[PDB]
Design a protein around this ligand. Sequence first.
Ligand SMILES: N#Cc1cc(Cl)c(C(=O)Nc2ccnc(NC(=O)[C@H]3C[C@H]3F)c2)c(Cl)c1
Length: 288
Amino acid sequence: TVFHKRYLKKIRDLGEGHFGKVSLYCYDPTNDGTGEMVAVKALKADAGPQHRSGWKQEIDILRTLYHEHIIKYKGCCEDAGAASLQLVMEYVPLGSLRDYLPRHSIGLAQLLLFAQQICEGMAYLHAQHYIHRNLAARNVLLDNDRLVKIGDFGLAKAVPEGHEYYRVREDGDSPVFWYAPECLKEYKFYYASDVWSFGVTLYELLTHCDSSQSPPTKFLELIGIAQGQMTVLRLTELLERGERLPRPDKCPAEVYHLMKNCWETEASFRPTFENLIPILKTVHEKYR
Ligand SMILES: N#Cc1cc(Cl)c(C(=O)Nc2ccnc(NC(=O)[C@H]3C[C@H]3F)c2)c(Cl)c1
């Protein structure tokens, strides 16, 4: 599917993705204003060959993904400037949960439904032999009060059929506070590593994405802000000692134990996304 730059009418900037920026456009070829609203992710004009290789990979992954809980791929636009492809995706009306939740007091049952939907989209992603590597509330988008979709796949990678993990590099932009100990220490990203990130995401939902309760805030309170290059090493140490993010206010005990099960040190002791779907359906049923 092809989109024309001449028919794209910019409304506002939505935010910063991974390789570039996301903007809100109205694709209006008729010029009457009845055109559809699109979210266009563009690669920055000054990006090197390393980011351009990863950007093409992001588009290839999104194109091959088709799920109700994964952001819909609409097409691509011919970007004459920067000489790259602009990723055209569906506009999710309510936005990220990190922005929506601190302003809208959402019930426990609805939060548990979102977690179930995240697991539904993630199990499909894993069945397609892909890892997300960036599962967080800022990347989970809301369509309506009952529908959730996974948005940013900038760090998503394909795990080969034979292998069970993917070896990662030493990067500054890595969401370390959402990462399992095997990602920080051995630089290995398993399917079980995404489950750890879900637990951290579930923690964010229960806190209603309160920035003073966020994982970088709580972990740096335990690490300390003056530890040189040893922030990640100190983070690895406390996780090895069994220290975890605290139980959120008004969060049920069994739900916190499920969060702690997603946060098991040994990756094999962690439930798969397919294991979490019947569980979260039952948990949501109890609180609805
Ligand atoms: N970090 C990060 C980060 C930054 C951005 Cl921009 C995105 C993203 O793709 N956001 C989108 C995409 C489509 N619609 C909205 N919808 C809205 O923004 C609705 C509020 C109204 F504009 C937000 C993601 Cl998934 C992660």
